[PDB]
Design a protein around this ligand. Structure first.
Ligand code: MTV
Ligand code: MTV
Ligand code: NA
Ligand code: NA
Lengths: 415, 415
């Protein structure tokens, strides 16, 4: 496999729409390389439990279906994996907190494409299969049929990203983009859509992209395949995340009468808005309400307009399919009396991020509170994120050097 | 207002469908009393942003619309309020854990009723108003239009409960039943449906049924009305709850070689399945996987059939609109080495119940882990639930008698 993660500061600083060059990459195997001259002839087959199976070329999609341009936040299931790895080593690429990127995606509605084949009333799922050939054969997975037909979910088949034709690494020439759901279901190099009454039976649907129960050890999961065949553990909708980006790791700030603007981003699954983002400087004893900016709502408020030949119709939805940004000003004098900054979000289902880590075999969907340690050094404060992408230098490295237990009630820090 | 809560043991023991006589009751004011002879003439007006406003009598609903019979779990937003009251006294009826009841509801689809009036493309909400007249005028609130049109959500206008004509306390002759959403939105004695592009402006929509941010004090909420006018804090979909019912409060069990079957129920909002229910006997250090029974899935598997003149079509949905039951056998010898039983659920969005209480002004949607204390007395164990409905006798009463801080890292219990 191949994985690349943008620097957290660069991701935040780029703002609501991440440049294509910075978008994170996750490939299970070799990328199928498709030359520009072959793009328009790329063919997808629609089959299974449908009245009228058909095949369609990209050029035909572009001419025959309504075209949309939609901002969507993509998130890898493995985001924040390194934090879990610090607690107990496991398999998988050690993502920091920047395994997410947000783009305008241009293409057709998957529901329109499937609708044309007329799915059976007994159908429940749409299987998706890619043209790639990683170690265990073609990558494939699935999504609920009803979600494809739901305008609030805006599931797309995209052929442009921020108005550019897709790069090989991002699925050239065609991929599914599934908002509010882990990147694992957004199948790249799309070849086949199969309408079914049951989930995918693809190897990658079983043995990846699952949050196994916490008490299942890696040895149990290796020795008993049944752990990977219970749909209750398959990841679809994202869980709620909030990340601190300012102050930056190892940032040093002089203590003064000035306020400092703590800041970051949040995202969530299933189109459910994050209703509140709260910060604590006293280890969760009291919480302060951050100001949230939802840039997607600006697109919602603009009504209908076109970008890259596609209709922007955020205005037709109430869902939140993109990340939001948050800010909170605090006096430096208060930070100087604090040992850490914690952030947590609660959504419009009144579900909140947990205090407690949920360690699991694939170390996926790690959404316990993100913590930035505060170290006072003379008349200045220095700040430490939990982990750094690809290097030491976070508070978890320090706590391990101190002999501490990161899972204890004080994050392994002394008293 | 008037509130009544069934005994927790009786609620559990009754099983998947709660008898009408045991169903919890929540009225904000006097109940409008409607004689049997007046039922069929009861009229509802459909108005607002629609092409064709109309009025319809109950008898006409019964003859003109498709009739369904659907199991739905109802839950009061105030369930588990007494637990919060033990921490810091607040306003509101002190619910234990049994402010929930599950019934077969018979009636028409709200989406069919609204669909007939042809809502404007700009419409976003359906306001609902009741015939009652509590202190601040007619009770009214709202629900998203798109949710009314979604078959997975099965929002109904019901006139029978477990096959009986509705009782006055339960909305006779007609109410809305909104699955997966707090009982507050399931408007009783329904008189008016108004299609709008914005939320309800009813007094009860603002000043009740909200989870205000935790740092907002009762004094802040009393003095600044704006806290109650931000939709991000209005409750719709339920959050995830799991409750221990066995062992019962003050139950005493002889320590032996025998296993004991710990047991209870769970429920969740938005039709999202609870994928796992986990129990800890070691204060969250390790977790054990419970067995979950989902009786709704039996109705799903039965295909189409009729109950009380209504189509049962659970088979058409994938959503979970009802509670589930859970069981876990443990050796009594292991319980004897333990100081408590904790239970928590995680749903199919990989969102888990929190360790930390989220105290709030209305003390609503309290879903931190439910804890049963274990007290060893000679060769026996005695068990204590957090609180008892209407009386002392739980571990929270005991912890307060001990001078402890329930919000501390050990639930206020010694070391
Ligand atoms: N055909 C195909 N092969 C893949 O390996 C494959 N991996 C995916 C995963 S697994 Mo994760 O939930 O472990 S994030 C993620 C992404 C990321 O897309 P990007 O590289 O365009 O960011 O595409 C998904 N789609 C795929 N499609
Ligand atoms: N018209 C009307 N008046 C009410 O006071 C009223 N209260 C409700 C609340 S507020 Mo809560 O989220 O504070 S639970 C709940 C229920 C309960 O219905 P039941 O009495 O049939 O159990 O109906 C809701 N519907 C109502 N409808
Ligand atoms: Na909220
Ligand atoms: Na789950």
């Amino acid at each position: 496999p191949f994985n690349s993660e943008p620097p957290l500061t660069k991701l935040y600083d780029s703002g609501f729409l991440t440049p294509v060059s910075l978008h994170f990459v996750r490939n299970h195997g070799p990328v199928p390389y498709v030359p520009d001259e072959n793009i328009l002839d790329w063919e997808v087959s629609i089959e299974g439990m449908v009245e009228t199976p058909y095949k369609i070329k990209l050029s035909d999609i572009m001419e025959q279906f309504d075209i949309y341009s939609t901002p969507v936040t993509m998130v890898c299931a493995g985001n924040r994996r390194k934090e879990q790895n610090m607690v107990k080593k496991g398999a998988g690429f050690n993502w920091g907190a920047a395994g997410t990127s947000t783009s305008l995606w241009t293409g057709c509605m998957l529901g329109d494409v499937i609708g044309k084949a007329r799915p059976s009333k007994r159908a429940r799922f749409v299987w998706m299969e890619g043209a790639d050939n990683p170690a265990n054969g073609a990558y494939g997975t699935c999504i609920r049929l009803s979600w494809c037909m739901d305008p609030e979910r805006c599931i797309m088949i995209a052929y442009q990203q921020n108005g550019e034709w897709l790069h090989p690494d991002h699925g050239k020439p065609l991929r599914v983009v599934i908002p509010g759901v882990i990147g694992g279901r957004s199948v790249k190099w799309l070849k086949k859509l199969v309408v079914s009454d049951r989930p995918s039976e693809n190897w990658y649907h079983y043995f990846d992209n699952r949050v196994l129960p916490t008490m299942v050890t890696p040895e149990m999961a290796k020795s008993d395949d049944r752990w990977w065949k219970d749909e209750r553990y398959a990841i679809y909708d994202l869980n709620l995340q909030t990340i601190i980006c300012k102050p930056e790791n190892q940032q040093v700030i002089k203590i003064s009468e000035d306020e400092y603007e703590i800041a970051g981003f949040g995202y969530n699954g299933g189109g459910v808005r994050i209703g509140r983002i709260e910060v604590s400087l006293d280890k969760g004893k009291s919480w302060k309400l951050a100001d949230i900016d939802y840039p997607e709502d600006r697109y919602r408020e603009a009504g209908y307009f076109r970008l890259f030949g596609g209709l922007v119709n955020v205005c037709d939805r109430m869902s939140c399919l993109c990340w939001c940004f948050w800010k909170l000003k605090v006096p430096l004098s208060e930070l100087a009396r604090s040992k850490d900054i914690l952030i947590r979000g609660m959504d419009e289902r009144m579900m909140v991020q947990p205090r407690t880590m949920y360690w699991n075999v694939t170390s996926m969907l790690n959404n316990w509170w993100y913590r930035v340690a505060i170290i006072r050094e003379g008349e200045s404060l220095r700040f430490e994120h939990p982990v750094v992408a690809n290097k030491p230098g976070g508070w978890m490295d320090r706590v391990k050097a101190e002999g501490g237990d990161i899972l204890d009630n004080n994050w392994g820090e002394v008293d």
